[PDB]
Amino acid sequence: SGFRKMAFPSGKVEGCMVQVTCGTTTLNGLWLDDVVYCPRHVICTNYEDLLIRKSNHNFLVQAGNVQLRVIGHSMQNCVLKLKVDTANPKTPKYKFVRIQPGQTFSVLACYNGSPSGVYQCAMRPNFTIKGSFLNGSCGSVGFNIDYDCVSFCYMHHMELPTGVHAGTDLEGNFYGPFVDRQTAQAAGTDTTITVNVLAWLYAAVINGDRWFLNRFTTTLNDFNLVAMKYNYEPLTQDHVDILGPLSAQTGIAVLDMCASLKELLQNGMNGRTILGSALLEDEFTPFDVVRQCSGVTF
Amino acid sequence: SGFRKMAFPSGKVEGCMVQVTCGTTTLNGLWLDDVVYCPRHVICTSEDMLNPNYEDLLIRKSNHNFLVQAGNVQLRVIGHSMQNCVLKLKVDTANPKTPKYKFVRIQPGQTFSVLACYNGSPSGVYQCAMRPNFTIKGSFLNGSCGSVGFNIDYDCVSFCYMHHMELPTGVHAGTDLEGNFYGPFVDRQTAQAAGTDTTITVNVLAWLYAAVINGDRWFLNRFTTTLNDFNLVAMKYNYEPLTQDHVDILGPLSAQTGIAVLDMCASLKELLQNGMNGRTILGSALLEDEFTPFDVVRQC
Ligand SMILES: *c1ncc([N+](=O)[O-])s1
Ligand SMILES: *c1ncc([N+](=O)[O-])s1
Ligand SMILES: *c1ncc([N+](=O)[O-])s1
Ligand SMILES: *c1ncc([N+](=O)[O-])s1
Ligand SMILES: *c1ncc([N+](=O)[O-])s1
Ligand SMILES: *c1ncc([N+](=O)[O-])s1
Ligand SMILES: *c1ncc([N+](=O)[O-])s1
Ligand SMILES: *c1ncc([N+](=O)[O-])s1
Ligand SMILES: [Cl-]
Numbered sequence: 001s002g003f004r005k006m007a008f009p010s011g012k013v014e015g016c017m018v019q020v021t022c023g024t025t026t027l028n029g030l031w032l033d034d035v036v037y038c039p040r041h042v043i044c045t046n047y048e049d050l051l052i053r054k055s056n057h058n059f060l061v062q063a064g065n066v067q068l069r070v071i072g073h074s075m076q077n078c079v080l081k082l083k084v085d086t087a088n089p090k091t092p093k094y095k096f097v098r099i100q101p102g103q104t105f106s107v108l109a110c111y112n113g114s115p116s117g118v119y120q121c122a123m124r125p126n127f128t129i130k131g132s133f134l135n136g137s138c139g140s141v142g143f144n145i146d147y148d149c150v151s152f153c154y155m156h157h158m159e160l161p162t163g164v165h166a167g168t169d170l171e172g173n174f175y176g177p178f179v180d181r182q183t184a185q186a187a188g189t190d191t192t193i194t195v196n197v198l199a200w201l202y203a204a205v206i207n208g209d210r211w212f213l214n215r216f217t218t219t220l221n222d223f224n225l226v227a228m229k230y231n232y233e234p235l236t237q238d239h240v241d242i243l244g245p246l247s248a249q250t251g252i253a254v255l256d257m258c259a260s261l262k263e264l265l266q267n268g269m270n271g272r273t274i275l276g277s278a279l280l281e282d283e284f285t286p287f288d289v290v291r292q293c294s295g296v297t298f
Numbered sequence: 299s300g301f302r303k304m305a306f307p308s309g310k311v312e313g314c315m316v317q318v319t320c321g322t323t324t325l326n327g328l329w330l331d332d333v334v335y336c337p338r339h340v341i342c343t344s345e346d347m348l349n350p351n352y353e354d355l356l357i358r359k360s361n362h363n364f365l366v367q368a369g370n371v372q373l374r375v376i377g378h379s380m381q382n383c384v385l386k387l388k389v390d391t392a393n394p395k396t397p398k399y400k401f402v403r404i405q406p407g408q409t410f411s412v413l414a415c416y417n418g419s420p421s422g423v424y425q426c427a428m429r430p431n432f433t434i435k436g437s438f439l440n441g442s443c444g445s446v447g448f449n450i451d452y453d454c455v456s457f458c459y460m461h462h463m464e465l466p467t468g469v470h471a472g473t474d475l476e477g478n479f480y481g482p483f484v485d486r487q488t489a490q491a492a493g494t495d496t497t498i499t500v501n502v503l504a505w506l507y508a509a510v511i512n513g514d515r516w517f518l519n520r521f522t523t524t525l526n527d528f529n530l531v532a533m534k535y536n537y538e539p540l541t542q543d544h545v546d547i548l549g550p551l552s553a554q555t556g557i558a559v560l561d562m563c564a565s566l567k568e569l570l571q572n573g574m575n576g577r578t579i580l581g582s583a584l585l586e587d588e589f590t591p592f593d594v595v596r597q598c
C-alpha cells in the first residue's frame with residue numbers, strides 16, 4: 001500500500017556520466033560506447049563557425065579520476081558528439097527515444113559529472129519540465145527503463161525565466177519552441193494533463209480514497225468543453241482506451257471518473273485531500289499507475 | 299531553479315540487493331561485504347506469525363535452509379546469527395560492489411531515500427521522512443520487506459532503515475540496520491496501530507525559507523513571535539513543538555535570507571490561520587514537512 005512519485009533506479013545511468021570541459025565551460029556528458037554526448041553550448045565563448053575552429057584536444061573529458069582522450073568531434077543538431085578512444089565498459093543496453101507531452105521520465109541531476117539526485121518528471125504540454133537544476137547541471141539526462149533497456153529521452157540545456165527547464169532529445173532536437181542561446185525566451189502558457197489526472201484518481205481509488213466518486217457519467221464532448229474552460233488538455237478516445245485497464249480494475253468507467261473530475265474542477269476539494277494532495281496531480285501516466293501497483297522490477 | 303523532492307542516486311545500493319528465501323517465504327536482503335542482512339521474520343511459518351519465538355525458530359535452521367540469490371548467482375550461506383530483529387547471513391563471497399557505508403539510526407523528522415525492491419530487484423526510488431510517530435509513508439507492496447532507506451551525503455552510503463511491515467492505516471514500520479525498531483512496534487502480527495501523527499514544524503519552516511530563496515515573499519508579515527507563543531498556537535494545529543535546537547538549526551537559512559527565525563514563525567502562524575487563498579508555495583497547496591534544513595541547503 002501507499003502511492004508515491006517514484007523514479008527509476010538510476011544505477012545504469014550513473015555509470016555513464018562524465019565531465020566535459022571546453023575552455024572555461026564545464027558541464028555534464030553522457031558516455032555510451034566510445035562516444036560522449038553533451039550540449040553543443042559547451043563550445044560557446046555561429047555554432048558552425050565555432051566548431052570548425054575547434055580541435056579534438058580542446059575538449060577535456062573526465063570519467064571519475066580518468067581522463068578520456070578525444071579523437072573526433074561532430075555536431076548533431078544541438079548535441080556535440082565527442083568520439084573517445086575507450087568504450088564505456090559500463091554502457092547499458094540502451095536506445096535513444098523522443099517522448100510526447102504528458103509522458104514521464106526520471107532525471108539524474110549531475111554536477112561536474114557527478115550524479116547528485118534523481119527525480120521523476122513529466123514533459124509538460126508547453127514542452128518544459130518542472131525540474132531542479134542549478135548552475136552546472138547542463139547535460140543531465142532523463143530516461144525510462146523497460147525490462148533491461150534504458151531509453152534516453154532528455155538532455156538538459158537551460159533554465160527559462162519562470163524557473164522551468166528546457167532541453168533536447170539525445171539527437172539534439174529541442175522539445176518545444178526554444179533555442180540554445182542567451183536570448184529572450186519564455187514558456188508558453190501551460191495546461192494540465194487530463195489523462196494523467198484521471199490515472200491518478202484511479203490510483204487514489206485503488207488506495208481507498210473514494211469520497212470524490214459519484215453516481216454520474218458524462219460524454220467526451222460535454223467533458224471536453226469543461227476541460228477547455230479550466231485549461232485542461234482535451235481528452236481523446238485514445239486516452240479513454242489507455243485507461244481501460246484501470247476502469248476494469250476499479251469498476252469506474254472513464255466517463256464516470258470524468259464526472260468526478262468535472263465536479264472537482266467546478267467545486268474544489270471542500271477541504272479534503274486525494275493521496276495526501278490538495279492539488280490535482282498530473283505527472284503520473286496510466287502506465288505509471290499500473291507499473292507501481294504491479295511491483296514491476298528492472 | 300525549481301524545487302523537487304529529490305532522492306539520492308540509487309546505484310550504490312542497487313548493487314547490494316539480493317533475494318533471501320527460507321521455506322516458502324521470500325524477501326529482500328542487503329549484501330555488504332560477506333554478510334546479508336534481512337528481516338528475521340523470513341523464518342516465520344504461516345501457523346506461527348502472532349507469537350514467534352525467533353530464538354527457537356533459528357536454532358532449528360541449517361545454513362542450507364537459507365537460499366540467497368544475487369541476480370543469477372546463488373550465494374552459499376556459511377553461518378547465521380540474529381541481532382535484534384535483523385538476521386545476518388554470512389556468505390562465502392564478499393560483494394565486490396560493496397560501497398563505502400555505515401549504519402546510522404535516525405531521529406523523527408529526518409529524511410532518506412528508499413529503494414523499493416521485489417524478489418531482490420529494484421523497482422523505484424523515492425524520498426521519505428521518519429514521522430514523529432515513527433512510521434514512514436512509503437510505497438510497499440507484498441514482497442517489499444527488506445527494502446532499505448539510505449542517504450549518500452558525500453560518497454559514503456548511510457543505511458538508516460529496513461522495511462518490515464505495514465500498519466492498518468497504510469503506513470509502514472521498520473528497523474535500523476542493527477535491527478532495532480523505530481517506535482514501539484514489534485515483528486509480530488498482533489494488533490498494532492500508529493500513534494496520532496503530527497507535522498514536522500522545523501521542516502515546514504525550512505521549506506518556507508526555500509520558498510523565499512526561490513523568490514516568493516507573499517506569505518511574510520510584519521510580525522514576530524516568542525518561541526513559547528508560537529508553540530502554544532502551533533500545538534493547536536497538531537504541529538510538533540519547536541525547540542531552541544530547531545531555532546539554532548535554522549540559523550544558516552535565516553542568515554542567507556535575512557529573515558529571523560521567529561519572524562518566519564510568525565509567518566507560519568498566519569498561514570495556519572488563513573490558508574493560501576488559492577495560491578501555492580513551491581508548487582504545493584499544503585505546507586510541506588518532508589524537507590529538512592539540511593535538504594534545503596543541499597538542493598539550494
Ligand atoms: C553560443 N550561443 C550563440 C552563439 N553564436 O553563434 O554566436 S555561440
Ligand atoms: C534497448 N534494449 C535492448 C536493445 N537492443 O536492441 O540491443 S535497445
Ligand atoms: C547549459 N547547457 C546548454 C546551455 N545553452 O545555453 O544552450 S546552458
Ligand atoms: C497500487 N497497487 C496497490 C496499491 N495499494 O495501495 O495497495 S497502490
Ligand atoms: C532552493 N529552492 C529554490 C531554489 N532555486 O534555485 O530556485 S534553491
Ligand atoms: C563511510 N563510512 C565508512 C567509510 N570508510 O572510509 O571506511 S566512508
Ligand atoms: C513483509 N513481509 C512480511 C510481512 N508481514 O507483515 O507478514 S510484511
Ligand atoms: C513472522 N512472519 C510474519 C510476521 N509479521 O509480523 O509480519 S512475524
Ligand atoms: Cl448520469
Ligand SMILES: [Cl-]
Binds near residue numbers: 278279581582
Ligand atoms: Cl498539494
Ligand code: NA
Binds near residue numbers: 216257259260
Ligand atoms: Na461519476
